[PDB]
Amino acid sequence: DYDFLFKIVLIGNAGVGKTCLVRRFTQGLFPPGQGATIGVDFMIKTVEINGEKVKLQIWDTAGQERFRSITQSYYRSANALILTYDITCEESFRCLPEWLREIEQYASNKVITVLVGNKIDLAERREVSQQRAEEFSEAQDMYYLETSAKESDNVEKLFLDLACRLISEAR
Ligand SMILES: Nc1nc2c(ncn2[C@@H]2O[C@H](COP(=O)(O)OP(=O)(O)NP(=O)(O)O)[C@@H](O)[C@H]2O)c(=O)[nH]1
Ligand SMILES: [Mg+2]
């Protein structure tokens, strides 16, 4: 048995690396030749946060617009949403207001949302500056972290810090 169970759902545009992120955390390896998610995928992992056993239930949703009505049906039952963009794609960033709008209608009003900028191993090809992203997230009152599923940068920290904050929330 665990001390806590939380339901985390990753969302964001197609191609931003939501799958490689979940899989790198949950399996410990960056998945080679990863293809687009069809519908929603589900993964599990139990983690120790300061002696507490926390089971994460993680839903990994399709980016592709055509699955969008179905991925949205998963929001209401989530404890947290990991909203994801790709630092090297300005449009995935520019989309974010629209995602927050969705989350407002379809997620629960107790949902925690974090923002992840993925693919920092490609930092020199970013199209959204660190400062832009931090200013957007300061405006949204949203925790922001820059990750690399590929090279592991901040992938563990992402979910372990969110678990810790979900613990505090449950108390
Ligand atoms: N350099 C680099 N490439 C990455 C990283 N994370 C994912 N990618 C790549 O970017 C592409 C998209 O990855 P994927 O995890 O499928 O993204 P997704 O957000 O789940 N897409 P979908 O919504 O279609 O399921 C893949 O080619 C994957 O290898 C990263 O941290 N760095
Ligand atoms: Mg995917």
UniProtKB/Swiss-Prot annotation:
Catalytically driven reaction(s): GTP + H2O = GDP + phosphate + H(+)
Domain of life: Eukaryota
Membrane topology: Lipid-anchor
Enzyme class: hydrolase
KW Hydrolase (keyword) present: yes
Known regulation of activity: Regulated by guanine nucleotide exchange factors (GEFs) which promote the exchange of bound GDP for free GTP. Regulated by GTPase activating proteins (GAPs) which increase the GTP hydrolysis activity. Inhibited by GDP dissociation inhibitors (GDIs).
Location(s), subcellular: Membrane; Golgi apparatus, trans-Golgi network membrane; Golgi apparatus, cis-Golgi network membrane; Golgi apparatus membrane
Stretches for region Switch-II: 63-79
Keyword check for Lipoprotein: yes
Positions with a binding annotation for Mg(2+): T19, T37, D60
Gene Ontology molecular function terms on file: GTP binding; GTPase activity
Keywords from the UniProt entry: Cytoplasm, Cytoplasmic vesicle, Golgi apparatus, GTP-binding, Hydrolase, Lipoprotein, Lysosome, Magnesium, Membrane, Metal-binding, Methylation, Nucleotide-binding, Prenylation
Cofactor: Mg(2+)
Disulfides per UniProt: none
EC number per UniProt: 3.6.5.2
Positions of region (Switch-I): 32-40
Residues that coordinate or bind GTP: V16, G17, K18, T19, C20, T37, G63, N118, K119, D121, A149, K150
GO process annotations (BP): Golgi organization; Rab protein signal transduction; vesicle-mediated transport
GO CC, alphabetical: cis-Golgi network; Golgi cisterna; Golgi membrane; Golgi stack; intracellular membrane-bounded organelle; trans-Golgi network
Function statement: The small GTPases Rab are key regulators of intracellular membrane trafficking, from the formation of transport vesicles to their fusion with membranes. Rabs cycle between an inactive GDP-bound form and an active GTP-bound form that is able to recruit to membranes different sets of downstream effectors directly responsible for vesicle formation, movement, tethering and fusion. RAB30 is required for maintaining the structural integrity of the Golgi apparatus, possibly by mediating interactions with cytoplasmic scaffolding proteins.
Comment block on domains: Switch I, switch II and the interswitch regions are characteristic of Rab GTPases and mediate the interactions with Rab downstream effectors. The switch regions undergo conformational changes upon nucleotide binding which drive interaction with specific sets of effector proteins, with most effectors only binding to GTP-bound Rab.
Protein family according to the UniProt entry: Belongs to the small GTPase superfamily. Rab family.
Full protein name: Ras-related protein Rab-30
Source organism: Homo sapiens
